[PDB]
């Protein structure tokens, strides 16, 4: 999955929008969730 | 917080400082002023 900062590998990319757990780079967060 | 849709602020007028939503980037008249008089370098979106 593209990103401004660069390619994120073994993350899903998701719609919704949470808080921001880890941060990544321009407004884009990660974070561990539901499987899981 | 959003303002609301109309502007009865007792005859005070904040068009130019509240957000224009014609723009791409929700940046108000002032707020594009300065980010085009300032003259930046290397934005690093995958140059
Ligand atoms: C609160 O905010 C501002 C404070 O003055 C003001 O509303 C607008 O102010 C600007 C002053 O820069 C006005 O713009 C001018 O209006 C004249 C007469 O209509 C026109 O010649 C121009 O407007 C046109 O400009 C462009 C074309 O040249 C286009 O963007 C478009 O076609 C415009 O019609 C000139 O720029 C503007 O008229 C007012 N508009 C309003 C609704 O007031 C006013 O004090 C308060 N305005 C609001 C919305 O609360
Ligand atoms: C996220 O938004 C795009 C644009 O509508 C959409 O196509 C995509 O399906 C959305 N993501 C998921 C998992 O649905």
Same mark, same amino acid.
């Given at each position: ?7 994120? @590998? ?11 757990? @880890?941060? @990544?780079?321009?407004? @884009? ?8 | ?7 009865? #602020?007792?005859? #005070? ?19 594009? =002023?300065? #980010?085009?008089?300032?003259? =930046?370098?290397?934005?690093? #979106?995958?140059?």
């Amino acid at each position: 999955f593209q990103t401004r900062a660069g390619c994120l @590998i073994g993350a899903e990319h998701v719609n919704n929008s949470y808080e921001c757990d @880890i941060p @990544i780079g321009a407004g @884009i967060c990660a974070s561990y969730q539901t499987s899981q | 917080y959003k303002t609301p849709p109309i502007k009865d #602020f007792g005859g #005070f007028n904040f068009s130019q400082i509240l957000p224009d939503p014609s723009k791409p980037s929700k940046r108000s008249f002032i707020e594009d =002023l300065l #980010f085009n008089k300032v003259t =930046l370098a290397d934005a690093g #979106f995958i140059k």
